[PDB]
Design a protein around this ligand. Structure first.
Ligand SMILES: NC(=O)c1cc[n+](CCCn2ccnc2/C=N/O)cc1
Ligand SMILES: NC(=O)c1cc[n+](CCCn2ccnc2/C=N\O)cc1
Ligand SMILES: [Cl-]
Ligand SMILES: [Cl-]
Lengths: 540, 540
């Protein structure tokens, strides 16, 4: 019996579990409810806080995954199954988890809140690659992670209506942040040192919380990994949201008979349908064939988001905030096997000039033919315009720059130029255990396992250099959480990680090699995406 | 009166003069009349062949220079005075010069025919840098240079009218080519191996003879140096030519102020004006402030040019033709000190970005504001968007690529892919005697003195390494004229100069170092000018 594993919070008591790490034990509290189950009449509505409970809630295992699509493109393949749900699917899924060092810290400890990615259509906090036991044990911080609603259940929006207002998945995250405010002190946490961090759609969410006033007062630092709220895939307008919501209703038989019709009676019909029925038609509402586009994402409503994320980044003040931001080397490769012609996981994907011209249409959807011509102009190597290997890397960079790198570099510059101290990285190491083919390089999402210290797990087959690389990255992230500065405070013998400024544009390469300061985050390419291509679309 | 200084040609007899070179003598015949003086009622009309004469025409000195504007921007400055007339100005100027070795060759010798440059408004065959005594002595060739009418005298055009049909300066060059066919044998030359070569507007002229059927039967090889007929400055439309011709007439009081009627009374008025009065208003007819644009240039009339040079090149058969093309390292620098803001010959020309954006509108005249945005995007270094030394170098590349390098590269690819054997170079040696500032690099026009062996003149302070470099280039040019292949005819010992193909795009660097093969004649930059920019402007 340990008094460490019995905690009282505002709602009741919890029984935790003690986990082993190669270098010490850690207390965990997996499956804590922070909201009433959004089932039946609550589907599509904002979350209500959990009513207090009598007795002791068992918090020894992860709760259910939120209802989501399950990838089946490559069954039995490690590269895809590692992101698929490892628990049962249920709309009863609003639960968070807390990791804490053993023994519990006696002084207030910085808290790290993780928001998982998954294109706003998938993801769970229970994935093996988000295990916070290694980061908590080694750097003696407090880690909190949550489940938020994804897909139609979290982002179906009929704007104006109040039966399905939209962005309820973002409200699921905000409620979990208020929970950390009201309750993290019971676990040894400091409600005055909260660092949000996420990846992909999690990094976009972290960014959208920077831009929503009610959420701004709930955290103090931010880490955005391979994502940004200004990405072309992260938001939609009220009109397109209404269209996608309406066609999803039609595909599942709503409304029955004539279309009418009240938004009230359309949502009423959607609430009667089984959850799996809505999931099976989620991809049929995309307007065109495209990679890196998702059906139900945050909407610009006027409530949670006052304006477009690009507008609020420009007309904002970010003094006193510190932000860590970065991308991986090959951001766009992972998405090319999901629709781009000529691409396969199981061959070299040496595409022809014709397939490259068609892939540009899938990688940059809804563009004038002239805008398509300009992309082909900037990314072709006109000395070898038909080298398939070079065409392969080009389309990967087209998707990577358009969706991740350049929206990130856009946001990074505007933050430093408006108060915030910003540090930037580029993750360049390819894990030895990576199951994707060699030509994909360092794909989207494969820095997470090093940040969470997964290579320290003895059951894994990582190399000794990567274990050292893991603790080094865990040091950086934890230092940023405590001090707002990833540099080791009491250490002038280590390479300095200089801030990212709008003029010098300095970043570092995270690798098995020591730090290496570079300049320009795809500077020449992103000037096309951020400066010229907007004007080329204002032609017509 | 040596036995070889007296020659009988179809029109009569000539007395030549014997010139000295540091390694032997050379016979010269300077000032041979090949056309009737285009004066009085003959102004603006095509040339008439020279009537036969009695007695002996003295051909011991250069004749008069055609009436042309004289550069007064930098008085007394060697860099500009070397292109200014060195004989009296007169409309009586249709004369050619023939250099031939001593003793006269016993077998038919290949003929090089030189067409000078000067933007179709200036130039003369009597300039010191066009002295063919060093070329014909070292490589035993027959060199022929003529004068052609420049400016309004050679290129004023009222299309449709027979009083000023236009392109008469090109007809002057052709009539001189017909003269070479009927008379070069009397000097030891072979009228079945005539190699045209010119620079700047002379290279554009050489190119336009390739596209005019009546002229293509008068030569067999071509060398285009820093020029091409498809350059944006080398032609104008019939509508623009009429507008410039009538505005020049207005500025000199034509028509007889004021009864604007038929083109007959307009040209009749222009014929009564002194030659100097027309020249004094040449630059006032340009539509706008521009660099590398000239008032009276050849016109697409449907006669000499049945279609635009771009059209005739794409739809042409060039089998059995050898073509040598090339450019200098810094093509655009020379033209910046004439119209570009912030530029001066006597300072470092470290322009600001505000001046860089204004020079783009002067270097690329008459493009939409969106088209200017694209140029700025491509030539800006977005890591140093305000570095003055980089903006200076970038504006030099804009003017150079837009007007010379890319119009050349387009022509070179179409010639090779359509039958012609093409060799290409890039001249990269800055002469030690060059008087222009250091930041101009190797400017437009400063390879000519090495091709003509001018460093071999002992009175000039060239270095020993430059004399050898001159003989190297004189060999390449003579080997091309003799064989059609610049490589030493049976020499595997020397490095090899490979041809230029549309796929490989191989060229050589002419420098004090031995030959170095390279791929890509500004391949990425020219893809913007040749491929994308036309589509950007055809979408107004
Ligand atoms: N009298 C004037 O205002 C005047 C204007 C332009 N110019 C053009 C200079 C001649 N030039 C030489 C090389 N390139 C050029 C013209 N570029 O536009 C000369 C004189
Ligand atoms: N059944 C189908 O036709 C289908 C279409 C799209 N998907 C989306 C695959 C998930 N995905 C992962 C990374 N990126 C994407 C989607 N677009 O890029 C799945 C199934
Ligand atoms: Cl992912
Ligand atoms: Cl010149």
């Amino acid at each position: 019996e340990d008094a460490e594993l019995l905690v009282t919070v505002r709602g009741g008591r919890l029984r935790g579990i003690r986990l082993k790490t190669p270098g010490g034990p850690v207390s965990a509290f997996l499956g804590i409810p922070f909201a009433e189950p959004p089932m039946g009449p609550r589907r599509f509505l904002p979350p209500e806080p959990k009513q207090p409970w009598s007795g002791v809630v068992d918090a020894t295992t992860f709760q259910s995954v939120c209802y989501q699509y399950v990838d089946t493109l490559y069954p039995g393949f490690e590269g895809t199954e590692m992101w698929n749900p490892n628990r049962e699917l249920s709309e009863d899924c609003l639960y968070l988890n807390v990791w804490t060092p053993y023994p519990r810290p006696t002084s207030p400890t910085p808290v790290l809140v993780w928001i998982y990615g998954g294109g706003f259509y998938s993801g769970a906090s229970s994935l093996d690659v988000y295990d916070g036991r290694f980061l908590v044990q080694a750097e003696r911080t407090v880690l909190v992670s949550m489940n938020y609603r994804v897909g139609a259940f979290g982002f179906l929006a009929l704007p104006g209506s109040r039966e399905a207002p939209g962005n309820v998945g973002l409200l699921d995250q905000r409620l979990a942040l208020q929970w950390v405010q009201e309750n993290v002190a019971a676990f040894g946490g400091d409600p005055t040192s909260v660092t949000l961090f996420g990846e992909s759609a999690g990094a976009a969410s972290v960014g959208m919380h920077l831009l929503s006033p009610p959420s701004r007062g709930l955290f103090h630092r931010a880490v955005l990994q391979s994502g940004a709220p200004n990405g072309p895939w992260a938001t939609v307008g009220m009109g397109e949201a209404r269209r996608r919501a309406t066609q999803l209703a039609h595909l599942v038989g709503c409304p029955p008979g004539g279309t009418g019709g009240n938004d009230t009676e359309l949502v009423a019909c959607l609430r009667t349908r089984p959850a799996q029925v809505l999931v099976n038609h989620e991809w049929h509402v995309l307007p065109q064939e495209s990679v890196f586009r998702f059906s139900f994402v945050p909407v610009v409503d006027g409530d949670f988001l006052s304006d477009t994320p690009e507008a609020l980044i420009n007309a904002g003040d970010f003094h006193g905030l510190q932000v860590l931001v970065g991308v991986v080397k090959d951001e766009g490769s992972y998405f090319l096997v999901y629709g781009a012609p000529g691409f396969s996981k199981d061959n070299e994907s040496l595409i022809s000039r014709a397939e490259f011209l068609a892939g540009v249409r899938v990688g940059v959807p809804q563009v004038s033919d002239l805008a398509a011509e300009a992309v082909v102009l900037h990314y072709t190597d006109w000395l070898h315009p038909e080298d398939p290997a070079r065409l392969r890397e080009a389309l990967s960079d087209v998707v990577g720059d358009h969706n991740v790198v350049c929206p990130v570099a856009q946001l990074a510059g505007r933050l430093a130029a408006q108060g915030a101290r910003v540090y930037a990285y580029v993750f360049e190491h390819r894990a030895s255990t990576l199951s994707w083919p060699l030509w994909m390089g360092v794909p989207h999402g494969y820095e997470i396992e090093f940040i969470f210290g997964i290579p320290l797990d003895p059951s894994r087959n990582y190399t000794a250099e990567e274990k050292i690389f893991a603790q080094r990255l865990m040091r950086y992230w934890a230092n940023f959480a405590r001090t707002g500065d990833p540099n080791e405070p009491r250490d002038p013998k280590a390479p300095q990680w200089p801030p990212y400024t709008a003029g010098a544009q300095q970043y570092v390469s995270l690798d098995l090699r020591p730090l290496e300061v570079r300049r320009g985050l795809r500077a020449q390419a992103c000037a096309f995406w951020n400066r010229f291509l907007p004007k080329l679309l204002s032609a017509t």
